[PDB]
Amino acid sequence: VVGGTEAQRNSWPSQISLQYRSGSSWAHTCGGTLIRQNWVMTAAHCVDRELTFRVVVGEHNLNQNNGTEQYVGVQKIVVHPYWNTDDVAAGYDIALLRLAQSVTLNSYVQLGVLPRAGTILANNSPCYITGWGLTRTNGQLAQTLQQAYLPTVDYAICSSSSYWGSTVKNSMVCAGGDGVRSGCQGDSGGPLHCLVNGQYAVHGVTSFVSRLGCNVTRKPTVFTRVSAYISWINNVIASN
């Protein structure tokens, strides 16, 4: 997250860190949202590589013991069957991860609530992106979980020629684009939390930013629209 602030450690208890095994250690690669005690929602592109993955719930500082973490292996990966890794603009950037164990819930570890199917946010709706991704274009990962306030940019504006044009689909949510605040590499797969009827819900799964940089004016961060995939999610969980 470029232009973020440090999150309070109990603000976003559904955020997870998706990590892969790297030598004798683990490296953060993406975010995710805990959606059942044994299921995480993330981006398909985060799991393209043939790596050993784990999830960390209750994580705040990637580089320090928080006293709240639970570490769990990924047992099964179910990528959306229409996903194509060389065509992120087509959409379908979503995957579900079945965890090897069911995590225990507490103020640091909670299920993300998802929007009702079909819900589309009005332009300029209030949302926060969260993650440990780069804090500058071509920078480095955050140590502590960051949040940034990123208002939605509706489809009509986001798919206009000076924004994303054809590359953004109605199956996506755009947010931000102010040139200061954005998602960045390492935020992919995590939540976009939007405040609706008094309750935050996870409306987006972080998918992509501009090849020209993270915080680029009129290139809002682009998310998979969770509300387009409610039946898919429920079908995967029911059949696994």
| Least Å from the CB of residue 144 to Na ion | 9
Rounded CA-CA distance 222/174 in Å is 5
Rounded CA-CA distance 130/206 in Å is 9
Active site residue 93: yes
Which member of 45, 80, 193, 203 is catalytic?
45
Active site residue 87: no
| Least Å from the CB of residue 67 to Na ion | 8
Active site residue 60: no
| Least Å from the CB of residue 175 to Na ion | 27
| Least Å from the CB of residue 58 to Na ion | 8
Which member of 93, 203, 207, 227 is catalytic?
93
Could you write out the DSSP letters of every residue in 26-55? EEEEEEEEEEETTEEEE-GGGG-S---EEE
Task: Confirm if 76 and 240 have CB atoms less than 8 A apart.
Answer: yes
What x/- string results for residues 47 through 86 when contact with Na ion is judged by CB under 5 A? --------------x----x--------------------
Burial class of 154 by CB neighbour count within 10 A (0 to 12, 13 to 18, 19+): middle
69 assigned to a ligand binding site? yes
Phi-psi region of 15 (alpha: psi -120 to 50; beta: other; left: phi over 0): beta
Q: Give yes or no for residue 144 binding Na ion (CB under 5 A).
A: no
* Residue of closest CB approach to Na ion: 66
6 assigned to a ligand binding site? no
Task: Confirm if 40 and 17 have CB atoms less than 8 A apart.
Answer: no
- Please state the residue numbers annotated as binding site for Ca(2+): 59, 61, 64, 69
Binding residues vs Na ion (CB under 5 A): 61, 66
As annotated, the active-site residues are 45, 93, 188
